[PDB]
Structure formats: C-alpha cells, structure tokens
Design a protein around this ligand. Sequence first.
Ligand SMILES: [Cu+2]
Ligand SMILES: [Cu+2]
Ligand SMILES: [Cu+2]
Ligand SMILES: [Cu+2]
Ligand SMILES: [Cu+2]
Ligand SMILES: [Cu+2]
Lengths: 336, 336, 336
Amino acid sequence: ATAAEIAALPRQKVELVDPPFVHAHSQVAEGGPKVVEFTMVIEEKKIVIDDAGTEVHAMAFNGTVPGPLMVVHQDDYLELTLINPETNTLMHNIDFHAATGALGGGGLTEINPGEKTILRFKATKPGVFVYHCAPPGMVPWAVVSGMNGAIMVLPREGLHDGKGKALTYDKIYYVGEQDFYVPRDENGKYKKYEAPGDAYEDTVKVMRTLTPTHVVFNGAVGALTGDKAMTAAVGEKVLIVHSQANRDTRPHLIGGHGDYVWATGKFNTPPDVDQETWFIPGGAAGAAFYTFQQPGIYAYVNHNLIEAFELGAAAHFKVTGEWNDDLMTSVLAPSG
Amino acid sequence: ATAAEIAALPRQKVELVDPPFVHAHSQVAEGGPKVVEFTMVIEEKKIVIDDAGTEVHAMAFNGTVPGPLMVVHQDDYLELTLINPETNTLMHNIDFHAATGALGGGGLTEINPGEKTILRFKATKPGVFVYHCAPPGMVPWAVVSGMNGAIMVLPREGLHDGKGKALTYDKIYYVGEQDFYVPRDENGKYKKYEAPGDAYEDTVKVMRTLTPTHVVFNGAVGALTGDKAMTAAVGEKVLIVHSQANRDTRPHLIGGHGDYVWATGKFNTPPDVDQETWFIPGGAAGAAFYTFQQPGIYAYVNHNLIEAFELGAAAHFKVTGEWNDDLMTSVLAPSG
Amino acid sequence: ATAAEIAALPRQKVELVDPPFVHAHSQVAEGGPKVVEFTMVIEEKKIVIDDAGTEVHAMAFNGTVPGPLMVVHQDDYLELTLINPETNTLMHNIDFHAATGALGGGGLTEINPGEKTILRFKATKPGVFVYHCAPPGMVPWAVVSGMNGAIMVLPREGLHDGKGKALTYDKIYYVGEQDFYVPRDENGKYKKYEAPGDAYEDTVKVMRTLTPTHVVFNGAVGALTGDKAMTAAVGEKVLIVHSQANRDTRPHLIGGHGDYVWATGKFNTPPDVDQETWFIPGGAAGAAFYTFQQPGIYAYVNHNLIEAFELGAAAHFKVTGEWNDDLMTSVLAPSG
Ligand SMILES: [Cu+2]
Ligand SMILES: [Cu+2]
Ligand SMILES: [Cu+2]
Ligand SMILES: [Cu+2]
Ligand SMILES: [Cu+2]
Ligand SMILES: [Cu+2]
C-alpha cells in the first residue's frame, strides 16, 4: 500500500457513545478501507462504586469506566486523538491490544496534563480487543483505576459462524468488567483520599493480595440492573462484548446461553457454541451471540458467584415477548 | 411441539444413583423424544469434610454433594420433581444451565419447606451442564454449601470426535468439585454450628476473601480414594464428567491424559485432544474421554497442586491390566 | 514395538542448555524413531529471586528454575538419566505429563540422595508438556520450590497451522513461569532460612493463601530483561513455549500478538489465531508463534498486570529492524 494510497483513503469522524451502548456502525463494511477518527478526553475524577458511598479516583477514557467501544473493520485504520486536560494530575497514554508496535501505542502516546496526541494504526486482525492506559512504572495502577476499554474490529464482511453462515445481530452491548482494590482502615471502612496519588501506596498493598474488594460492570455495583438493565425481545439477536483488562472473568447469561461465543475474542478463531459459561482471561475481550427465546428478567454475571453477588459483577436483561411452554413450563407450581 | 404432542410422548422414570456413579442410560438414543422423569429430595444435613472433623451445613440435592448426574438426550424433555421436606429450614429452587427461560428454572421452582414442584424443560443443546440452587439474595451461599450438580445431554446419536468417528465409552464417572469456605476462630480452628443460618455471617466473610479453606471432590477430602477410588482396566474407555458451579478448576489425570476433552462441556464444540491438563471455568461442566493403557494407581486432580494436595482436590483411579513396557519402562531402577 | 526393536533403534545423546534457550534440534524429524538420551542432576540450592535479595531454597532440575526444555519428536523415546547427588537432603522423582503410566514416571523414579535412575517412555502425543517433581506427601512444595520444567514433542513433520500449512520458526524460547510463596516476618520483610526444611511450615501457610508473593520468569524478577532480554528482528518467526506447573497464567506480548497459539499446548488441537492474550492453566505448557513486524522493545507478561509488574512476571524482547508507519504512526506527537 503505497504512501499515496494511504493518504488518499477517506477520513471519517465518529461520535462515541457511553457504554453499554455502542456508536453507529455497519456490520458489513461500507466502502473500502477508511481512516476512522475518534477523539477521547481523559478525565480523572472521583466516582462512587457501591451503595455505601465507596469512592475511587477513577482515570477514565472519555469520562467513563469502562472507556467506550470503538468499532471499525479489518484493514481500516483507527486514528485516535487523545487529550489529557491541564486539570488532570497524571501522565496518561494508551495501549491498543489490536495494534502492532510501540507497546500497542503506549510508547507513542505518553501525554502530560495539558497535552494531546494523535495515534493511527491499521486494524489488521479481526476481533474484539482490550485497550488500556499503561504509563511505564504504574501500569496496573492506572488499569485497575478504570482506565481501560475495548474496540471491535469487524471482518469487512460481517460475522460468520463456524460453517461460514452469516451471523447478524439486531443489537450490541459492551459490558466492561472492572476489578477495584479499595483500601480499608482498621475498622474495615473504605478510606477516602483528597488526590489520586494519595491513595497509591495503600492501593498497591491491596492489589498485591490479588483480591479485589469490588468486581463491577459499567463502573459500579448495580450499574446495569434495575432501570438500567439492558433490553431485548424474544427473537432478537444480541451480541454481548465483554472485557476485563486485568483479571479473569467467566460470563454467564442466567436463563440463557451463548449460542456462538468467540471466547478468545478473535473472529478468525471459530466460535464455541451452546455455551453455558465462557471464559475471558484478564487482558482480553470476548464476544457472545445469543438469540433470545424466552421473555422475562435475565441476570448476566461473572460466574464465580461470590464475585457476582457479593462483589458486584451482576447485570440484568429485561426481555419482552411471549413465553414458550415447549422450552420450559411449570408442570406443577410450588405447593405444599 | 404443541402441548398435545408433548403429552403424547413416552415417559421414562429414571432412578438416580449417588456420584461418582451415573444412572443406567444409553449413549445412543433408544427411540424418539421422550419425557425423562427425575425426582430429588432436598436434604439440609451436616457433612464432615476433612479428617480434622471439620463440618459444613450442606444443602444437598438428593442428599449428596454434588447432586446426582441426570442424563437425557438432545430434544428429550427433563421433568424434575423437586421436593423440599418440612424438616428443612430454607427455601430452595433449581437453575438448570441446560434450560432456557426463567433463570434456568429458578424463577419457577422456589419451594418453601413442606412444598414440592414439577419443572419441565426441553434439552435443546447437547453437552454437560451445571445445575444449582439460586434463591434470590442467597445465591452464592447455597451454591457453596454444596447445592449443585450437573446433567448430561447426549447427542441423539451418542458421542463423536471432531471428524465424526464415534466415541463410545465403557464407563462414566461424575466428579463434582466443591469450594468450601469454613469460618475459623481466633486460634485457627474451624468453627462448628448447630444451625445452617447460624454460620451465615461468618461464612460470607470468608467467601469474600475468594479463598476457599477446602476444595474437594464428592463433598470431602479423600472422598474418592480408598473404598471410593474409581476403577477401570487397561483398554477401557472412560468418560470423566467434572463440574464446578462457583470457581475455576483445571483437571489432570496423573499418569494419563484427556484423549478427547470437551473443555467447555458442549458437544457441538469439537473436543480438544491429547490434553495434559484441561480447564473448566467456575459455573460450568466439562468432560474428558480417555482409554487407559497402563495398569496401576492414578491420581485425578485440580492441577493447582496446592488446591489438590493441601486443600483436598484429589481422587484416585485403580486400574487393572498388564504393564506396557513400550510406553514406559524403568531402564535402571532407583539405585546407588 | 518389542524390546528387541527398541534396542535396535539409533540413540542420540543430547546436551541440555539453560532456559530460555533450547538445545539444538530439527523441527522436521530426520529419519525414523530414535531413543533420545538426556541427563539431569538435581540441585537443592539457594537462589535470589528479586533485587532486594529475597532467597528461596530451590529444588532445581539441571540446577535451573525452570528445568531445561527437552525436545523430541512424536514416537521417539525420551530416556532420562536422573541423578540425585548425595549432597542433597530430600528424595526426588519426576512426573512427565507427556508420559503414560506410573504417575507420569513418578512412581518409577523416586531416588534418595546418592541415587540415580533411568526412565524411558514413548512420546506418543505431540505438543509441549510440563514435567515436575512429585514426591508423595510433599508434591506442591517441590513444585513451587522450582522443580518443574517442560518438554516439547514435535510432530515428525514439524509444526503446521490448523489448515495444513507448515509453520517453521526461526528461533524458539522457553519461558518457565514460577509462583513462589515466601514467608514474611512481622515487618512484612521476607524471611531467610538456614536449611530448606526450616522454611516448610511457614511456606505451607503462605501456599494456603493461594496468593504467591512472587510470579517470575526464568527464576527471578527481571531475569529476562537487560542483557538477558530475548531478541528478534522484523520479519523473524519466533515460537514462545510457556509453562506453569502449578498456577494459571495468561501470556501477552505487549506490542504484538500470538499469530498462532496452541493454548492447550497440544499440536493436534488446532491453534487459536490473532490472539491478544492467551491462557495456560496451572499444570500445563502452551506455545505461541509470532512473526515480528515492528522493531523496538516489547514486554512479554502474564496479563494480570499486578502479577506482571508488582509480582515479577515480565520479560522483554529487543527487536531490530525498520519501523512500519503503515502499521502504526504518531500523526501528532505529545504536545500542548
Ligand atoms: Cu492513564
Ligand atoms: Cu495490555
Ligand atoms: Cu437451595
Ligand atoms: Cu449458574
Ligand atoms: Cu524433587
Ligand atoms: Cu502434574
């Protein structure tokens, strides 16, 4: 691909939307290779992550935890303008697991407060991939402070099953999973700090126990439940992209399955099928395709149930439609 | 299928056997779709999990930990009669990962002590699946108190390898692995309680450490050893179903291998081959097929060896037959 | 084959080399089946695992942690002469996950100090496999004290991808990952012991937390960095064999990918492709094949980033060559 050919490719700016929702995109590529442009402003800010007012000084791409899902197609280029406002206190950068070279982009995007940078990379491999901050010397701290997200590089011709049959989803959601390590005082109460740096020592100590105090979806316990449950209808095909930048997770749709699951998150690797519970290793993203068949409220969780129900890794799906008694029926209701 | 068509299907009452054994069944479907009937009584009882007399208040389906393995074929209907004796003190239900709708059946099977219920679901996906109690707000507690098992939904035409060659086993064993979280007093001694509800607060604190005090097969340290070691003979084909409803595991047959391993536990996903150690995520069941080629004692373990030899995750296999010197021989026995 | 036929086979004595290097071998087997001979002397020795000077009484095959990588081809016989010098104090043996029978050879190789033994086994299955000490009663202690390594059984026709295309690497490295559990005093300082036995009780207590104090490559924090960093060049094809005999790991090449990854380590199981982060469960070895495309420094880590950067699981690659601006380019360097 000559130098002229690359400079001639069309440039297209895209407006990002906050997770679990995903920005406008087409499953099958529209036109030839493009340079897809995105801009994200980094925000350091205190967020409350549970019903007890527990705080964390989050480091958030685009102001959200997880950062937004960026979608492009194989062989498109992703051109990110990353802005670090002077109001922030730390140097930040970004590592796209989808990219090749300079530590995923980290070595070329180190920006101090008051600086911005523009990185471009060719998305040569199809699949969902994690992206995260990675300042040399404090990589895990930045990541476990919520500075991570994922992108999806769709095959130019959309998704397909193991047999080559097309798999077109009606809706897509991005569930970013986050392990937080919040310090506690001797009485067991979560501590609060004035500035991000103040919590550093105490936090690394908790991190070393390899035991998170919270494991959440969309940045807080219950963020994807109640009135914020994701939605679908019977017959609707849904793609659920799930990521975990630092620690293993095992997604499970309670009352459902993963009809096709690219557990490694890479589309050239044939998807597993009829999954009850899939596995995504820390530092990766995966994707599950399911066609809902029963209406009702479903729970979507990390299937180490303590992490799901004691630590916060549980989301909900509200599904409309008609019940199918062939698939399931209460022959005899609960009775003495 | 219409309600009328289902009602016209033949019914077959199966009698369950305690793990690791599996009730009589046929690998290849004997005739068209039928309604396979099972009955299980919930028993809240005390179990001793180690040689130090450590106790756990178990919540056991059919009186055992794990609950028994139920076997049907794809597209059969599994009709479960679940009974919660008045002697029990808690509400219980059942979520079948193999089922579709109402949280796996959990939403339609909540039964208080003194009640019973009958659930019927269609086994549309082939493979081994976990089933476990899941009372709202009490989910992980019940599961880690031993209330879980698995079922196997065989393909109508039995098992096959990745190329369609049939795989027929001579024996089948079901190993249910359980992570227990037993509270300790200020002297490191495990605590005992006179009531299930009495140990709740103490147990949740331990559960939050995400560090089990015990990891066992069939409910206790050494359960599947000695009088309970599994058996086989050189030349015999054996399928080992293994589940873990709450935490990851990595099975390994010491001295052998997993010739064919459906690691995700789903039969429409080709099995991995020539496996040394496979992986099953918390919340799932998997299955390995192996043809013994050497006689002698074998150990079967969760290969985090601390979990296997310090925490209790180890079982034994006694194999009869002639030793094969081509495969292995001691050229020079241990000597000066 | 009969004893006579085995005795007639040619024999080749191989000289082992220290990890991450691998002894000379041919990817495509040259000639028919051979009895490949190896010799390893077990050394119980004190090793320093971090910059602070933390000590561990290692139990090391060939004097290194991990033990060296032995390479044979499918259906060759691996004949190991194992020596336990009289200067040692413990009985040792070896379990080859690649072998069939007697606990992987463990039951035939128990040698006391001052003894030796010669074990021979047929390498019937292709792939990388863990080997580790396993004296009944102290199995995990030996392994987490560093007594483990791996072997590679190459297909006689060399490596191929999932579709029959040959995969020939230019160089190979073996990364053995070790989880250590070092006791600490009341000041949180690592403790030193005069003899290995002295540390047993304290170490077992740490092991039970299932939380290693160190997670390292090639025996120590930073062991594969600086002048010991691995090397490659743009266009070079590298195979990275990775093992972990006791605990899970999720390898990731920062700045690159795993073009083909036999995550399970078994060559007859098609490899995953375009991987960002793969997963190797405790008790197994895996291998990733990658063709470098960008020059510069890369980090190779266990992608639970706390384990990589706080606990020690990080290695570096120095790659020579021309930068590819098509794959990645800084449109705008960090600036105001
Ligand atoms: Cu940052
Ligand atoms: Cu990363
Ligand atoms: Cu229950
Ligand atoms: Cu479940
Ligand atoms: Cu040893
Ligand atoms: Cu082993």
